[PDB]
Each structure stands twice: as C-alpha cells, then as structure tokens.
Amino acid sequence: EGRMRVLGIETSCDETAVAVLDDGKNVVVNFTVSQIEVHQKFGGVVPEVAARHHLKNLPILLKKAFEKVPPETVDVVAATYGPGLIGALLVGLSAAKGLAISLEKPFVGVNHVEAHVQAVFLANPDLKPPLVVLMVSGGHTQLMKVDEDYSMEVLGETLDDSAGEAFDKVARLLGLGYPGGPVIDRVAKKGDPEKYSFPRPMLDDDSYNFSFAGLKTSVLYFLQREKGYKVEDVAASFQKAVVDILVEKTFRLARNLGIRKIAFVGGVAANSMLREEVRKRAERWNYEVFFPPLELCTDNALMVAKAGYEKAKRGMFSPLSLNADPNLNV
Amino acid sequence: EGRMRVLGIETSCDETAVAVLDDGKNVVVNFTVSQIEVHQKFGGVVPEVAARHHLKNLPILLKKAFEKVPPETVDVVAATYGPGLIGALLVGLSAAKGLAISLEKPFVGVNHVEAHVQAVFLANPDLKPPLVVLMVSGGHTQLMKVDEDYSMEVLGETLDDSAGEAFDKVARLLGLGYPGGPVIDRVAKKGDPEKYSFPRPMLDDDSYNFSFAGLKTSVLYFLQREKGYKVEDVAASFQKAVVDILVEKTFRLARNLGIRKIAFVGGVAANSMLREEVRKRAERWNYEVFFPPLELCTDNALMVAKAGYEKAKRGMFSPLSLNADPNLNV
Amino acid sequence: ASRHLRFENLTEEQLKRLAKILTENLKGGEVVILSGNLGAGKTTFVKGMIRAIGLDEKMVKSPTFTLMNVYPGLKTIYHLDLYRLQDTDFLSLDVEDILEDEDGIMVVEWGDLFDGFWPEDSIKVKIEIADESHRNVEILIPEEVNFLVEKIERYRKELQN
Amino acid sequence: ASRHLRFENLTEEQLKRLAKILTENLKGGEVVILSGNLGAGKTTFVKGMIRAIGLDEKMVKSPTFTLMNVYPGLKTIYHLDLYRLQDTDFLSLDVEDILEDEDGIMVVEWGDLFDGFWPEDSIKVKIEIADESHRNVEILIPEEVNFLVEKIERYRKELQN
Amino acid sequence: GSHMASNVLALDTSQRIRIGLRKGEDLFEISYTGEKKHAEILPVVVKKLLDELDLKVKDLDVVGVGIGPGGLTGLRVGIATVVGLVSPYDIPVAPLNSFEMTAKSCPADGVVLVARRARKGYHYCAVYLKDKGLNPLKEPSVVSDEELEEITKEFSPKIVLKDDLLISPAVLVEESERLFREKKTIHYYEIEPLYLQKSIAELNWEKKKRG
Amino acid sequence: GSHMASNVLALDTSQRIRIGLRKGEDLFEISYTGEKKHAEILPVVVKKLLDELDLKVKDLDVVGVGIGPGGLTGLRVGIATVVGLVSPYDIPVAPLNSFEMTAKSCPADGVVLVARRARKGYHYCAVYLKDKGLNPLKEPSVVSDEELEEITKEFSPKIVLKDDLLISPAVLVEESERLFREKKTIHYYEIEPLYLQKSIAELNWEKKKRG
Numbered sequence A, B: 001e002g003r004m005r006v007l008g009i010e011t012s013c014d015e016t017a018v019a020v021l022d023d024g025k026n027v028v029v030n031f032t033v034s035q036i037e038v039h040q041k042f043g044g045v046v047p048e049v050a051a052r053h054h055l056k057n058l059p060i061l062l063k064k065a066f067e068k069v070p071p072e073t074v075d076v077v078a079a080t081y082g083p084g085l086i087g088a089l090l091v092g093l094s095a096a097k098g099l100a101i102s103l104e105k106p107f108v109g110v111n112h113v114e115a116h117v118q119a120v121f122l123a124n125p126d127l128k129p130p131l132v133v134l135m136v137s138g139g140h141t142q143l144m145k146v147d148e149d150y151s152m153e154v155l156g157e158t159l160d161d162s163a164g165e166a167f168d169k170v171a172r173l174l175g176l177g178y179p180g181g182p183v184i185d186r187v188a189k190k191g192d193p194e195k196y197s198f199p200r201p202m203l204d205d206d207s208y209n210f211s212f213a214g215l216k217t218s219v220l221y222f223l224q225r226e227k228g229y230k231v232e233d234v235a236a237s238f239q240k241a242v243v244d245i246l247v248e249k250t251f252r253l254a255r256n257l258g259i260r261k262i263a264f265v266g267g268v269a270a271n272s273m274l275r276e277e278v279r280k281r282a283e284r285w286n287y288e289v290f291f292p293p294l295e296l297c298t299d300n301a302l303m304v305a306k307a308g309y310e311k312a313k314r315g316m317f318s319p320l321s322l323n324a325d326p327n328l329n330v
Numbered sequence C, D: 001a002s003r004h005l006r007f008e009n010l011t012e013e014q015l016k017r018l019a020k021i022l023t024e025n026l027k028g029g030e031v032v033i034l035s036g037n038l039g040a041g042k043t044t045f046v047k048g049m050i051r052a053i054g055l056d057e058k059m060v061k062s063p064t065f066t067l068m069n070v071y072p073g074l075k076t077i078y079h080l081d082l083y084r085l086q087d088t089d090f091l092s093l094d095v096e097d098i099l100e101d102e103d104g105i106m107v108v109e110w111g112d113l114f115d116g117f118w119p120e121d122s123i124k125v126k127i128e129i130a131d132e133s134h135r136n137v138e139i140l141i142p143e144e145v146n147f148l149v150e151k152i153e154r155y156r157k158e159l160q161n
Numbered sequence E, F: 001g002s003h004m005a006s007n008v009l010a011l012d013t014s015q016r017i018r019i020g021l022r023k024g025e026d027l028f029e030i031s032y033t034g035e036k037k038h039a040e041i042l043p044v045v046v047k048k049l050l051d052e053l054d055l056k057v058k059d060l061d062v063v064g065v066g067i068g069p070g071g072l073t074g075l076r077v078g079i080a081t082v083v084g085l086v087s088p089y090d091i092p093v094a095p096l097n098s099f100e101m102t103a104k105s106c107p108a109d110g111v112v113l114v115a116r117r118a119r120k121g122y123h124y125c126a127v128y129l130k131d132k133g134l135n136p137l138k139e140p141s142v143v144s145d146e147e148l149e150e151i152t153k154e155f156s157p158k159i160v161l162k163d164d165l166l167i168s169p170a171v172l173v174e175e176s177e178r179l180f181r182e183k184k185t186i187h188y189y190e191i192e193p194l195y196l197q198k199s200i201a202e203l204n205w206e207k208k209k210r211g
Ligand SMILES: Nc1ncnc2c1ncn2[C@@H]1O[C@H](COP(=O)(O)OP(=O)(O)OP(=O)(O)O)[C@@H](O)[C@H]1O
Pocket: A160, A169, A213, A214, A215, A217, C010, C011, C012, C013, C015, C036, C037, C038, C039, C040, C041, C042, C043, C044, C045, C109, C132, C133, C134, C135
C-alpha cells in the first residue's frame, strides 16, 4: 500500500472544518463546526464551538480528528489559503504549517474554489475532464473550465451579486424569509413563470459574466409600481429569469469550448427549475451533466483534502512562507 | 595546476605572524612582527606594531599580505589553536575563521608544536618518516616520534624548566646577560667542560622525560659553596651536563623505536657543543640527523601554513566551532 | 456638529463620479458608512469609489457573503457589508483591527445597523431611490474632516449640464 | 593589618604538603603572590598546590616563557611567571581579565616585581633557601581572608615528627 | 515521566516576531522586523531554528505563546501555528501576557506603564509594580487619550513603554519555564487570547461615562 | 560607487553574543546565552545567518563591531572575527561603544547609568543623558564601590543598568548605519578597543587619591 493520507483544513469564511482522506477516495474524518453545532452539545469537559470562531474552533476539531486518526499516519497537510477573509484564512493556513513542521510532513496550499470543484471528482470517481463547472453558491458565482491535466480557468464571474444572494434578497422583498432559495423554489411551484418580465440594462451577449444586482432592483421597482400581483407569480417569474441566465451561458460556453460534460455545484444548483432546464438542454444537445450531493457543495475540508491529495500526487507542494491571499485568482 | 595556496596565522605566544605558501614548497609571503619591528619603521600612514599585541598587529600583517597576495587566490586558511595563551590563540583562530567565512574557503586548526616539526620537512623536502624530533626551544622541550603516515606522539617532555630556560637563568647566575644560550656557548669555548660536576636528584633512566630545575639550583649551590672558580669552566661544565642529558635520551629513544633519522629544532639546537656530540654519535651508530635553518625554528606562520597544507591534502579540515585549547595535546 | 450635503436626482454615472470625488480626497484611515435600502446603490457607489484608487469596477463585488472584500489600489479599500451579521463579535475583533489601519479606506454597507460602533469622524452617505434611474445622496462630513466639503461642493459644477 | 606565619627548615615534601593545605582551603577568586630568589622553589610550591585540585605534579611546568599556564582541576589554577615581562601591558589586560574570574586560583611567580598591581586581599608567600635541601616559608594572610590562619597553623602538627 | 524542562520553545507575535529556544545550556533568541507578514516568516524561522539545534517538536517540554494584548492578525498567526506544533503530541502550553512580557523585558525596576494605540484617540494600557516578580497596579484595559493622562498622574510614570514594545525572547522562555514549574500550563484547546478590542464596543456606545 | 547601505552586519561580543543583520526591508536579530564560548558560537551563527539570507560578505555595505568596554576574551573574539570578515574586501567598520549600545537599548529616556563589575570592589561605569540621541554626562571609567555611590548621588539614577546588560542587535545595526551615513567608519586595521582594564594599574598603585 502506497497509501497517501491527507489531513485537510478549511477556514476561508464562516465554516471551520477538518477532514482526513485516503488516496482521494476513502473518508476517515469529515468534521465541520456546523455539524458540531447543528447537533446538540450540552456543556462539556472540553470547550464549546460557535460559528466563525476559527481560532478556538480549529483546536477542538483537531482534538476530535486525532482521537480517531493517530497523527503519525498523516502523510500530507493541506489548507485553504484563499480567496476569502485574510483573518480567517490565516488560522487554517498557519495551523497547517504548524502541523507540517510538527509531523515533518510536506504542506499544500489549496485554492477554495478549485477545492469546491473536487466535489465533482469525489462524487464521480470515473469522471475525466475536460468539463465545465457552474459554481453557484451564496458566496461564489463562477463559470470554470477544467482541462485534460486538471488545470482550471475562470471564464465567467458575477460583477455584483451572486445568484444565491439574488434569491435571499428577493425573498426578503416578497416577505418569505431566509434562506431565500428554498422558500422561493417551494412557492414558485404553484406560480406562473411566464406572468411577469423583469427588464433591466443586461450586459453583453458574448460575455460569460453574470450580473444580478439589476434583476434585484427590477423586482423592487415592480412591487412599488404594479397593483394586485400574487407572490407565487412574482417568485416563479423571478426564478425563471435567474436560471435562464445561468443555463444559457453555461451551455454556450461548453458549446464554444466543444466540451460535452457540465457540472453544477453550490446551494443554487439544488433549484428544481434549474435542474429541469438543465436536463432538457442536456438531452437535446447530448451533454453529460453532474449535480454532486449537497453536503459536498457546502464549505468543508474534504474538498480541500482531495485538492491536496491531487497536488501532492503531482509533487506540487507549497513552501512554509506561503501567505494567505484574500484575492487569490485561479 | 592543481595548486593549493594556504594562508597561515600564528598567535600562540609572543609572535604575531602571517604567511602564504603554495603546494607546501613555494613561499609567497612570510611576515612576523619581529621583522617589522627589528627593522626600522619611522611613523607611518598605517598604524604601528609592538610585541604580543596580536589584536592590533594581525590586521597590519593581513593588510601587507593582501597587497602582495590577492585574497581570492587563497584556497585554505590555517591557524594555530593551541597550545599556548588562550587570549592570544583566540585572535589568530578567530580571524582565520573570519577569513574562511569571508572567502568561502575551508579552515584548518593547527597544533603549534606539530607545526614546529614541519620546519624539518620544509627544509628537507625529500625526507620521509619515520623520524624522531628533539624540539628544544625556550618554550618547548619535547621528544617526538613521527611515523610513516605523519602522525606524531610526544614521548618525552620537561617536568619543570625547558633547556633554553636553564641556559637563560644560569647565564643570569654567571652574570652573562640575556639571552643565556649564545653567551654561554661563546664563553664555554674557552672553558674546561670536565672541571665541575653538578650532582642532583636525577629522574628515571628509562623515562624519556627531562628535568632541569635541579641543575639550575645545583649551579647556584656551587656558587655559594665553592671558592675561586672561573666562569668559563662553570659555563662549559654546565653546558656539558645539559647536552649530555638531551643527546643520551634522544638517541636512546631512536634506538628503541628502531628509527635511524633524528631532527633537532629550536634555539638550543644551535648550540655548538650539542651539534658536535650529535654528529659524533650519528657517525658511530650510523644515523641521519637534521638541523633546520634558524628562521624556521622560531615561531612563524610558515610552519602553520605547511601543517595546514598537509592536513588539507588529506581532507582533515576543522569546523567553525573549534575553540582554542591552551593545553592542546599532540 | 456635522455639515450636511444633499445631491438630488443623480443618474448612475453621476452617483459614481460623486463617489470618485469623495475618495480621491481621502488621506487614509477614514470610514465611510454607506446607508440605504435594498437596491439604493450602495455597492454601485463603491464601484465609483474604486475609480479613485486606479482599479476597474469589475473588482467590486457584493460583500454580503464574504463580509469584507479587499481592493488594493493606490490606497487599499476595505469594503464591508453587515447585512447578514447576526452576532457582534466580528465588529469587536476583525473590523476593530482594520480601524487601526491608518492608510486604508473602510467603506461599510449597512453600517447604520450598528450605529454606535463607529468613530465620530466617520463619513455617513445615505442613498435614496428617487425613480427607476435616479438616486438622491446625502453626505454628512464631521468637522474633524471638514476639508472634504469644498471638494464635494465643486462637483455640483458637473450637474449644471 | 596582615598576619605573618613562618615555617622554618622544610624539606621539599614538607613544602609541597604546606602548599596543598593552603590551596585545599581556597574558596575561589584568590591570588597567591609567590616570592623568592632563583631556585627558592616557587615552581615546586605550585607542584604542591595542584595536589589540592586533583591533578598530577607532571602537569605543572615553568611558565617563564608561556607566561601563564592553565591547570583545570576541581578548581582552575592560573599559574603565572612575570620573570621575563618587560612591558606592563600584559598585566593591565590579560591578567586583569582573570582577576575577574571569581572561581579560579591565580598563583604568580615573581609577582613582587609589580607589587602595586595586586589586590590588598592577596596572599603573599616568600620562600628562602635555608640549605641545599631545606627552605623557609613565610605566608602573609590579610584580614579579609583570615580563616586560612587556623587551617595553616594546623600543619605544624606534621612537623613535630 | 515527570521531569524538569530541558527544551523550551516560546514566541510572541503580538507586534514583532519574537522567538526563544532553550536546549539544555543553550538559549537562542531570534527576532524579525520588516515588510514581510508574520505568516511569511514565523513558520520558516521556527523550522530552521529547530533543525539547526537538532530538535524535533515532540522533544519539547513546553511551548510558550503570547496571547495579547496586541494586533489581531499577529496573535492569530502565532497561536494558530503553536496549535499546529503541539496538537499532535499534546505538548503543554504556557500562555504569555504580551504586556507583562513587555514590562519584564525592561532592564530597570519600579513602576511601569505599557500602552499600545488602538483606533484614533484610544489606547490599550496596563500599569505594573515591578521588582522581584511583577504585580498589576491596573489590569490591561482600553482608555481614551484623555483617560490615559489620568493614569500617568494617578500612578507614578517611572518608565513609560509606549507604542513600540521591546520583548526579550529570553524573558518568554523564562516565563514559560516558570508557568511550567507552577503547573499553570494548559492544553492547546484551552487557549483564551486577551481581546481588549471587544471593550471599545461598550465604551464608545455612549460617551465618556461607564458607572 | 557611492550609495546608501542596504546590507548591514553588526555584532557585540562584550558580554553575550549579539548579532544583527539587515538585508533591504528585512532585519534579523540573534542572541546566544549559555555555557559555550564565543569562539564556539559567533562564527557558526554568522555563517548560517548570511547563508539563509543568501548573502556573501562582499555584499555588505558596513560591519559594526562592539569595541567595549567589556570582557577582554569576548571583545578579542568579536573584533578578530570581524577583521577576518572584512579584511579581504576592505569593507568599512563601524566601531560601537558597548556601553552606549547598552544605554540606547533601554526603552525609556532620561538619565542612565551603566556599570560592570571589574575586580572585587571596582566597577566600569558611565552616565548618559538620553532623549533624541544620547549625551555623555561622564565618560566610561573605573571606580571603587564607594566611588560608584558618589556617582549615583552626584547624578540622577533614573535608570541603573548594572552587571547584566541587554544589547538590542537592532540598535547595533541602527548605530552602524548612522556612523556610516556620518562618514565615521574606519578601516579594519584602525580598530582601537576601549580597554579601561588599563586604568586600574594607576588607581590602585597608591590608595584613594588621583589629583
Ligand atoms: N441612479 C442610480 N444610481 C445607482 N444605481 C442605480 C441608479 N439607477 C439604477 N441603478 C441600479 O440599481 C441597482 C443597485 O444595486 P446595488 O447592489 O448597487 O444596491 P445596494 O444598495 O448595494 O443593494 P443591497 O442593499 O442589496 O446591498 C444597480 O443595478 C444599479 O445599476
């Protein structure tokens, strides 16, 4: 057994996460503070966790990790170093370099959005690039290409608000609460998606970039202009606008790059209307499409460990001098 | 040309010395403070030298050295690190390590008395050990063996006063002045060496060690006991006692070790009566004997550079951590 | 006492030019509190500001999720949005840390949600929706930083058009 | 005022035993000024002293040329001889440096040549030639180090023989 | 089993990087000052130091770490790297008060006041009676520029360590050893940084009043 | 040709080993304290430091060296190694007064007295008025324990640096730079150590009188 065991760390934003992964396949430990919270934890004889408290949380998860995984068995240490909050990135990054020195093991700095994409290859071990990925969570709205060697480019991003952010804010406007995506999805089901149009200065046809800020305000304008509409119809009509933008561009890119496989990752990829539209076009133009499971798409250290394993296999290790970069570009 | 150029430093006692030597043969620079002093030096636009002022002298000699010898041509740096005065050794040793770091060249720590012995091999390039060396200056009175590989042991030393020291002090007693060796040699010529005996507790027959303290006092006792002696006769009779001790032991050692070559180095080796006695026995028992020139026998950096070249050829280099040892044992 | 400046009925380009003029003249270590309802143009305002540090508007994203974006230009702009902030801890620590950066420019969407937290010399910018393509903008300049007043009033020149 | 102790007509072995008793009882940071003519037995005295630091007499050489010998035993003895010293510089620097060693024992042959230089608490030892095989020894113990007196006078026990 | 410390690593990242490493009779101090960020220096220097002294982390008897008060980014880097160092072996951790370390790093004795500027017109500060050990005359807190002057009169300003604080790495090692000998060390998952940062939320929520 | 310093090495061996190395925006400080002798440490640490910063000696713009007052053996090692460093390239040398360096290494300002014990009942000492720069109220000299007390009254003993002297390597680098900018540097063959040692010969040659 030339087994490569990789301990991943992720502290880029809100989630503190630690994972251990064997040969980019076998999950040993997959902890997030979200789980430790969202499950009860009456007091303790070991401190407690809270969201976005990376410095005090990470130690906790490491303790847990090492109880299940004896430290000397770790071969490579991997951590997110950007993009995100400098203050948060630094905790994961710095602890990881700590462990490398301590365990006399090599170290891998991982890009958060690249990591997210590994969810596709974790979930589809047989899947071979090239492929196109729509990454479309609350934080991230990005169109990416993965080529034969597993290099990644960003070919489109939001110029303002993410897709998830559009759902969240429009849901507030419709008085539906938070998170916006789910409630709108539910409420739209019983609504007419052709009822209303949402015209606004739309950006370039050829551009693979996104803009949602103007769609947000367009719905506001509508509410303070029109009389006697129904939420179902507004939600449905807005939802249609968003997925129409996302699907057109994603397939257009794939066509022009001559790629035949497309993957969708992140909260918004859950959307039932998006999934239908995607399958329709997939069928018609003969594309393979992939929708990873949801617990892989949310921030976690597994995607980091995978990203790390793949870089380590290729001997692409990071120096101990690696600074966190909040604006890291893939 | 696989030419090895060695810069030597010597600051073990009274003399500050710097030398440069090529392939253990070709002398490039051979400076001693003694020369810089014992030759006039009216003022200057570069500071002045004085005896035993190693810290301020050595810089001077280095300046001189580098004017004749461009520094980058130096291959190895060698310095005495013992035995001697810690305070003095340290200056040479520390500057030498300085130069090694500066020139990115290797460094060799040299033993002062071992170095003295290199005068024999500088002066007799064809000479091959084994040989026996009587080292017999003012500081040093030592019987040494050099074996085939050029290793050295001390097989006899003084247990009190050196030979030169006996001459110096007895000369004071006879009111002849300083240095004692020369004046006694001159004055003894016109004296009877059989006139007086100097009985005292003599140490072991088998021992290869020396003791002169008791011979010193024996002459004192004589002066305050006897009446109407002549200086010539006392000087001659004392001189006979000393060389008789030195020659008996030196040849006895050589015989028992089955060595057929003997070398004499140091001030006292100049003694005219010693040289005669040595040649007599050399002739009779068929020994080769060597008396190096006098400017090689006195403290200087050339013997150091030679000692260094020979260690460097054999890859026996010293670390930068090497401390001065006032009691260094060969 | 603090000096109030009203700009009525600005197009989007005009609102951005106004943000550029404000930011051009900031020395370093300043705080701008961006106030206004959903869709008022807070994020659009920051797209104006970044002109002044020699970057493209492309770089300015909504920090609703990221919480704070860093734009490193000729000066560094720290661009916060506190919309979705539930606790108070992130202000006490992370933001407090940047308030000790005396070279950067901090601009904070929805800063008014935590009105007590900000220094007295903070610049307040309130954006109202006038119609579908115009906004009104009110800027409060504290006395401590009063030199800005002359710089901003000079912009009214462009609006005579 | 300083206390004078005379020992008359000591053999060589007796002189060494006396030097051992002196040195045994030295705490550290002491100076012994060895006085006496050529051949009095100053160097022989030091051969006695070294018994007390657990080394062989073999190690004790004349420092006439070396100027200072170091004997590192249970305590370190610094053994100086100033016979051939022409300047004054070596005292001012090198010896002064060792006077700041508060753990070692300094013993100085011909120390009396530079009588002014030594601290007041210095122990003075004067050796006279009595005959060809006996010496007289006078030791001056300053008040500062007065505990030595009882230790040394106890040696007279051995001399009743 | 239970023995006295031989190998001691301590650092403080609260301002400048300060690293102390004792190994037997050998104590090495290292500091860095420049444009490079803590994350660029601290781990590399720690690794090089350990390597040159032929030391592995597991051979360490205690690790000291500064916990503030100080710069948030710095503290986070320092503490986090320490967590990475010790977590695999549960090596005990000496939490070091950066202001106390500052006070003890001052050659003189008497009454000492330590201050670091916060946001314009405010300062972290503490006052210490310092002789054999060191005793707190007022615990580290936040004050305004005016309220700072109140403190400089209310106590004797014998020494005033202001704004640029010298930390002797030797002192870090010494304090780490002391806490270890006093059984005051803690686990890597029990570290509680001095965040005074948090006090400005309440003191500036009104005006110049708090009682 | 003539440019301002970028690469600056300075050390002081007058008590503990203190090494400072600036290279551009990067300043590294190193100190050693332990049983090992200066000759065992100073050269190895200098070499390692230079190597890790990818620096050769010839690339140095100035070398600072402490010249005393201090321990003879230490000073000799330090100065001698520096001579070895610079001699091949005639790199300029900043002579550093170890007592001044001590004074400047003290965070506070005002009136400062520095003292090191000589032979029992005597002390090297100097008094310094210290604010922007530093001004000598009495130059380093030798005194008895009694005469030391005369000085502690005759001047204000605001800070008293006695016996165990902290030297900040940063301060060594800074002073080296200053002397270099003031064209006060010297050649390696012009170094003149402060040997106060030599004053005890005359002051103890009589009694308690000298005028
Ligand atoms: N005069 C105007 N000034 C600014 N923006 C305008 C104007 N007219 C129309 N708009 C449009 O209104 C939208 C405002 O979006 P923006 O995200 O900047 O508002 P916001 O206050 O940041 O929203 P949120 O409260 O969600 O942060 C943009 O699409 C912008 O192009």
